Write a protein that holds these residues in place. Structure first.
Motif, PDB file in Angstrom:
ATOM      1  N   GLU A 120     -63.395 -59.814 -51.830  1.00  0.00           N
ATOM      2  CA  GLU A 120     -64.452 -59.641 -50.800  1.00  0.00           C
ATOM      3  C   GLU A 120     -65.818 -59.790 -51.320  1.00  0.00           C
ATOM      4  O   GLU A 120     -66.654 -60.725 -50.645  1.00  0.00           O
ATOM      5  CB  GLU A 120     -64.177 -58.014 -50.395  1.00  0.00           C
ATOM      6  N   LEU A 121     -66.361 -59.237 -52.125  1.00  0.00           N
ATOM      7  CA  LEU A 121     -67.709 -59.430 -52.664  1.00  0.00           C
ATOM      8  C   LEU A 121     -67.760 -60.628 -53.474  1.00  0.00           C
ATOM      9  O   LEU A 121     -69.052 -61.136 -53.274  1.00  0.00           O
ATOM     10  CB  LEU A 121     -67.881 -58.177 -53.782  1.00  0.00           C
ATOM     11  N   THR A 122     -66.605 -61.315 -53.728  1.00  0.00           N
ATOM     12  CA  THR A 122     -67.022 -62.690 -54.048  1.00  0.00           C
ATOM     13  C   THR A 122     -67.444 -63.668 -52.886  1.00  0.00           C
ATOM     14  O   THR A 122     -68.178 -64.377 -52.683  1.00  0.00           O
ATOM     15  CB  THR A 122     -65.752 -63.397 -54.739  1.00  0.00           C
ATOM     16  N   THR A 123     -66.496 -63.206 -51.883  1.00  0.00           N
ATOM     17  CA  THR A 123     -66.662 -64.143 -50.493  1.00  0.00           C
ATOM     18  C   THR A 123     -67.790 -63.623 -49.687  1.00  0.00           C
ATOM     19  O   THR A 123     -68.755 -64.369 -49.299  1.00  0.00           O
ATOM     20  CB  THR A 123     -65.406 -64.205 -49.826  1.00  0.00           C
ATOM     21  N   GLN A 124     -68.250 -62.187 -49.620  1.00  0.00           N
ATOM     22  CA  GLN A 124     -69.325 -61.757 -48.867  1.00  0.00           C
ATOM     23  C   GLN A 124     -70.584 -62.238 -49.441  1.00  0.00           C
ATOM     24  O   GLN A 124     -71.506 -62.530 -48.833  1.00  0.00           O
ATOM     25  CB  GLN A 124     -69.170 -60.466 -48.826  1.00  0.00           C
ATOM     26  N   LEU A 125     -70.558 -61.954 -50.909  1.00  0.00           N
ATOM     27  CA  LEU A 125     -71.856 -62.309 -51.537  1.00  0.00           C
ATOM     28  C   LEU A 125     -72.095 -63.839 -51.452  1.00  0.00           C
ATOM     29  O   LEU A 125     -73.176 -64.249 -51.434  1.00  0.00           O
ATOM     30  CB  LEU A 125     -71.667 -62.052 -53.043  1.00  0.00           C
ATOM     31  N   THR A 126     -71.067 -64.570 -51.442  1.00  0.00           N
ATOM     32  CA  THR A 126     -71.329 -65.845 -51.481  1.00  0.00           C
ATOM     33  C   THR A 126     -71.557 -66.463 -50.263  1.00  0.00           C
ATOM     34  O   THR A 126     -72.357 -67.362 -50.104  1.00  0.00           O
ATOM     35  CB  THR A 126     -69.965 -66.851 -51.952  1.00  0.00           C
ATOM     36  N   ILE A 127     -71.033 -66.035 -49.241  1.00  0.00           N
ATOM     37  CA  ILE A 127     -71.324 -66.107 -47.719  1.00  0.00           C
ATOM     38  C   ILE A 127     -72.638 -65.496 -47.403  1.00  0.00           C
ATOM     39  O   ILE A 127     -73.369 -66.326 -46.588  1.00  0.00           O
ATOM     40  CB  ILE A 127     -70.305 -65.748 -46.749  1.00  0.00           C
TER      41      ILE A 127
END
Lengths: 231, 231
Positions: A120-127
């Protein structure tokens, strides 16, 4: 005034690029935790070298905090990051009309809300980082706030360093195009001490890098103590 | 030079006396932990008010560290505090001839060695503080080093606050007689941050105020976080 701030965006962009090269090297590579303790040392070294270049170069309030808590409550509410970026964009415009710490609250609150939400935080931080980059690029085509965006990116790189390690380069590259748009420390050190605690909590609570709660607390203690020893 | 340092011993003696009155009140009184968290707030408030009055008022080295480790080893070796004060006195004279951090190492090393050794301090801290007071009084009758003695006393009061709570008054009273002998910050703030960690470890490891190791680590984390929030 405008110019030393412009080269100050340049110096933060350059140091963010050089620390981004070091971060990209560790990103090519326990390796995530090596990147994390490296990022703790990197936040310390970033503050040090940024200090060096800095030397070389030159009752409604309680309602506001309650609305900020309700903002976090609205914030709890891959496509999901797109909808969150959309509502965060509208809420950012409304909050900017309402008056910085608010904008950092609106952006980082969802990510810190996730990191508390499992607690999540990988994808949410990246997005969120990439979407702020692409939206800033669309603004650069179609046209302090800039240092606000880059400081949100520094919170992305420093606070969420344990998630994706290639995230440092993706900031500065986008930032350099902001210089093209022109052509056409205390909050940061606070974000850095919070980043030491936050990257320790990112490894300890988020990462999965009755002992384990105690060792997560002990790693927060030892990494805070060693990363405070280095700095 | 000598005079502003003399009134600086006076101002540290006065603030140590006023914080000693607050400490004596909490000493008349969970109450030890109330004194301990109060002493964390007191170390923070002491640094704050001392800053305010400060504003208003104006390869052999590796051998040395190895000898310091051996000094701790000799240091591990009620009457026992008297013999320890005797050998610490002789070792203090030899160490002063050898060259401060060494003297603080020699004095505090036995107490920190006890607090690691279970891993006493009431009696050893009281007898070391009182014996340094009585020996200083014998020196006052018979005759920077003074601020060294009072800073060792501030380490006694601040670092070992969880042991005996009446210890603050017993410093400054003795110190005021030192003014009679005349009549005839960075190390301290470091001792204060170490005192936040040390008083948290004094409550957690020493005090007795598989959960308990985790809650001791959590109290160190929460007390460090709240006492860092206040300061």
């Amino acid at each position: 005034k405008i110019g030393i701030y412009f080269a100050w965006l340049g110096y933060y962009t350059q140091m963010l690029l050089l620390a981004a090269v070091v971060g990209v090297a560790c990103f090519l590579y326990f390796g995530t935790l090596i990147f994390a303790v490296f990022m703790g040392v990197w936040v310390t070294l970033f503050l040090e070298f940024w200090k060096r270049r800095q030397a070389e170069l030159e009752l409604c309030a309680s309602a506001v905090f309650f609305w900020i808590l309700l903002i976090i409550a609205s914030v709890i509410g891959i496509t999901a990051s797109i909808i969150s970026f959309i509502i965060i964009m509208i809420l950012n415009t409304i909050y900017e009309k309402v008056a910085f710490l608010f904008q950092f609250v609106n952006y980082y609150s969802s990510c810190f809300y996730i990191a508390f939400f499992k607690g999540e935080l990988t994808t949410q931080l990246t997005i969120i980082m990439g979407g702020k980059a692409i939206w800033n690029n669309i603004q650069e085509v179609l046209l302090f706030y800039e240092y606000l965006e880059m400081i949100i990116q520094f919170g992305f790189v420093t606070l969420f360093v344990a998630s994706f390690p290639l995230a440092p380069l993706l900031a500065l590259v986008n930032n350099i195009l902001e210089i093209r748009v022109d052509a056409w420390q205390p909050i940061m050190q606070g974000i850095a001490i919070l980043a030491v605690v936050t990257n320790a909590m990112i490894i300890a609570f988020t990462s999965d890098m009755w002992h384990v709660i105690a060792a997560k607390l002990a790693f927060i203690i030892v990494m805070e103590h060693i990363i405070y020893s280095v700095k």
